[PDB]
């Protein structure tokens, strides 16, 4: 696309199912409620996938920005 930046991409993905990988290898799937300037992230109906396998169903979750490796829409 004509330049698609970090910020708009993430904003487009609000209201959507996402999965976030953390640096530590945990993964969290849920609906992205919001993100902020520092790229802290809020998920609803979160699920946890560790070793790529469903571990725990967690609900509403804040992820501190420094933990994030990458975010994927899914």
């Amino acid at each position: 696309s004509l330049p698609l930046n970090p910020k708009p991409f993430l904003n487009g993905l609000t209201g959507k199912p996402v999965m976030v990988k953390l640096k530590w290898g945990m993964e969290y799937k849920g609906y992205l409620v919001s993100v902020d300037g520092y790229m802290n992230m809020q998920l609803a109906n979160t699920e946890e996938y560790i070793d790529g396998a469903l571990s725990g169903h967690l609900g509403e979750v804040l992820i501190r920005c420094n933990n994030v490796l990458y975010i994927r829409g899914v």
Binding site: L62, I63, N67
Partner: protein, 85 residues
């Protein structure tokens, strides 16, 4: 700024302080702190009440801490739930 605390991802903390509800904090130390948020800030420093700290050593362990201050860098994840209920 208050708006960003109110509606942004930190609203999780803002909501927990207002409703005096419990939250589980997954923590860098591989420990989890389960309790109520008395105060919080940008960095996710917190003043916590009725904290149940849980961890593992395999053997699970826990311990009660009535009053404590958490430096926010140690935060991995903060969870709000039907936990308080």
């Amino acid at each position: 700024e208050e708006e960003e605390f109110n509606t942004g991802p930190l609203s999780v903390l803002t909501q927990s302080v207002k409703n005096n509800t419990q939250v589980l904090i997954n923590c860098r130390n591989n420990k989890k702190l389960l309790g109520r948020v008395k105060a919080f800030d940008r960095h996710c420093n917190m003043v916590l009440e009725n904290v149940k700290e849980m961890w593992t050593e395999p053997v699970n362990k826990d311990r009660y801490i009535s009053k404590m201050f958490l430096r926010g860098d140690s935060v991995i994840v903060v969870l709000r739930n039907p936990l308080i209920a």
